[PDB]
Amino acid sequence: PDPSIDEVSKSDWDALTTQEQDDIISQVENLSSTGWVNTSRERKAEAIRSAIAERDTLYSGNMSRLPTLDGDAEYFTLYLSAHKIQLFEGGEAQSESGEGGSVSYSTGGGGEKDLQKTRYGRMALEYVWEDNSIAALRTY
Amino acid sequence: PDPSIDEVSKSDWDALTTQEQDDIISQVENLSSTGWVNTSRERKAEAIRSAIAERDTLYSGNMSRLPTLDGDAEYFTLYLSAHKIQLFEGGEAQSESGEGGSVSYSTGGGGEKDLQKTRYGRMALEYVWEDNSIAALRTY
Amino acid sequence: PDPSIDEVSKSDWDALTTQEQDDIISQVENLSSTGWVNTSRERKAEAIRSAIAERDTLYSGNMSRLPTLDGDAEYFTLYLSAHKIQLFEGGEAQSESGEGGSVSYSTGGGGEKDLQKTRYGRMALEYVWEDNSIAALRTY
Amino acid sequence: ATTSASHHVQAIIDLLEAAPDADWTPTQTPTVKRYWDDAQSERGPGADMPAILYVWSPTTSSLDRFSMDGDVFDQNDSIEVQAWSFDETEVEQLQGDIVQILSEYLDDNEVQTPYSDVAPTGTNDFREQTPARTTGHYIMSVEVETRGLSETAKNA
């Protein structure tokens, strides 16, 4: 996209053209083979706007004078977006069964924090020190 | 590929021809018997671009002057790509069933972390000290 | 084969004739009763090329001036290749069921780490001190 | 004769293998197999390979009495052919092809085959079973019956 998802804050996202938003949405839709085609535009836009806001608030600033977001901020925001889109539908699929036949995914077995609950969450989690508390400070 | 996958960063990948990208994609498609043929080209391109960026951000630099990426950076980037593609398709298949019959793929529960959760992840994980903190440094 | 799998590195594999590669592929195909006949040549070639590169980078050199690859480098590279081929196909089946006829293959939990997760890996693992670190050095 | 086979499963394998490349709709002629030629985890083609047809006999062959003489049984045999591919279009084309191949020999008076009749009797779609996330195989099938007079050696 022309503006990248890491180049925009919440107020910037609201200031984008519909085309620039749709380009970013189209990038997020690459992260699933299903593309989430049965969820409407407004909900994917809300998830992205939320991911932007949550990055800028919960995953910003320094920790032992390292950035708290160590990985690529583009892909972090995309994975955080995909995580939110997934949670706008349900959990991870543990099992899916059709008119006939079935598949099951071993998507469980992780911890209890939100990011631990889904595949996109578990990817995003690596970009941000795995939520580890490595901060340090001193008297001067 | 003429430019192999370790010769390029995110901004280089975006500057390659479609032919150079498609040959790298073709190499990644060797890592599964199913080739991920029913996932579109752009989704595989996104996963590769993401793996390139993630390597250069999360799996770069040194620990006690050892490189953080000990194994071949080619096969590491391919495995990291294949891991992401598999997550775009919803993760591992633990079991499958239908009029073709049924199969179960001996996963167990596995580990909690993303690279532990899929076979391509687990192959990539050996290249990077199994994500351990071997780093050591001194006053001088 | 005339050039043996232990005599060739990644660059050498790319320099071999198609027949020399095919002889080595034919040797690898001996390690399964099925021969993996429904997986294409390119995928078996990629698995072998990867196993060669992975041997040379992750399973090379020394610890305490013992070789880190203690066993026969021929059979190590073959078992490492067979491990890779099997992982290009979902891994080991714990069970296979068809037209009523059914079987289960006693794999069990099988640990968590890469080489533990399939039979060919479990064989290859004995060649490399079971991934143990007998490494030792001293001041002089 | 094109087959002269011992048993119905091999007979239909021989018929499908005997088909010219021009009579298949896709670019690549499919590979024909007994259902038990391949292990389950490896069943169906890989990417960059031709589609696979699996042949077997799913139900009991009947052996009806033909007459009081007992020279022959009126034998009725049953077969299923499953087409496996990753392309949902290819399995549909193969279902068409299998019908068009095995709709030759419909009233073969034991000229090409050891049978009076080889006939597709129905077809199945199983594409609804392939889960949409994963790049798993699509499956479709043809059901084939087969009939002839089978010698008893009662009267030597």
Added chain:
Amino acid sequence: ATTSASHHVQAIIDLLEAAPDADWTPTQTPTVKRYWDDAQSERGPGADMPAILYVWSPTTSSLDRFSMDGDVFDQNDSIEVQAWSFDETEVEQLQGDIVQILSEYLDDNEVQTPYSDVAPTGTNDFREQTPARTTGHYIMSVEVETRGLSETAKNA
């Protein structure tokens, strides 16, 4: 004319897609899909989206001998169309609509479709299954059968 499709599932998708917006009872024209277009956790429409119809073939297509010439199978095909929506009345309207749409072509002598006959043969209500606490899809369906003369190439 309207379809000329290679298989019954595509043929009925084409018929439902060919329907004018004015012939659908709701404000928004439904989306028509193969059953296997969508993953299970995402099956059915999201809120504010138009309703979804899923088409597939649930049972074996019969091929019967038409005559002892062997030129033709009397082919009988089976389909189900499932309507998914959050609105209990919308699915009921869609069931009415699907029956109406597919009640054209009732004795189409291969003019519109590749068939002699496309007909709704039964309908199902599954609204009783939807749990009342949760927002969740109501489902109803039309069962459709489809009949025609299908060529064998026996006599070329």
Added chain:
Amino acid sequence: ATTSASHHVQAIIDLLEAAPDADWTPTQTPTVKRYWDDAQSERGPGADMPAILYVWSPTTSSLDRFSMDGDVFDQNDSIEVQAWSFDETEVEQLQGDIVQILSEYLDDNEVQTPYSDVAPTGTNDFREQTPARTTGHYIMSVEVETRGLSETAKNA
């Protein structure tokens, strides 16, 4: 006249709701619901409340061809009505009421209903299921078929 409803489930709900208070045996007129109006853990009445009737279609409706014209389907529809109460006597009375209510309209010329025929075709007792130890609902039901000529788009 009395209903004019688009679907059989709402049609029979409209009939049961149209019954005068005098035509029910108990003191309180029952409440009529679709099976999916209520969640399971609170399905059936509370104490100090009127008995509840749940209506739904349990099985496939038939659409048979009426003639070569294709102008109409002979449509046969199926419904179940379940009566829920804590009084074993009240459910028995309600079963007798539902029967004698829905035995009006037995041969409408689409006069009251949109049907040729609405008929109770059988009745069920399930009182043996209610565990005697706990307070809990008794259930009984009426099975109702419904038949009429139904239009088509064929001739417009």
Added chain:
Amino acid sequence: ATSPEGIWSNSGALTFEDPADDSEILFAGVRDVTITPAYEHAELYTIDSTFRDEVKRYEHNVNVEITYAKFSLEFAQEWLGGPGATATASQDDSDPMKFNLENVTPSASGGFERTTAVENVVFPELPLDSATYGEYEEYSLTGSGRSVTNLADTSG
């Protein structure tokens, strides 16, 4: 010559006309239609040979059998009234009502369109009421036309 071909029954458009006008008489809802030109045959045999010496044809008529399920009040009043009149009661006169009949029917492939036309069909008896409990009424006509006026491909 035109290739012989299968015919889907429901494709046929049967109509009746008053031969005084060529005006249509309303008739509908056919289920069975048989039209059969016939002659009596006389065969010559003599002592000179055991084989047939000659065969000749006489007493031409066209047998018409119709089963139908929509009652036509016009058709019945025409049958009662006799040629060029309608009646609400039996008529005490010797002239039966003569109907011109035409049936137009496409081939299953559309390869030809037969028109069969029959002059002066008369029916010895007319069913008025044909009730069976729990069924729609069904009616059988047996009659005889004077000759076939037309049997041709109507296409183009």
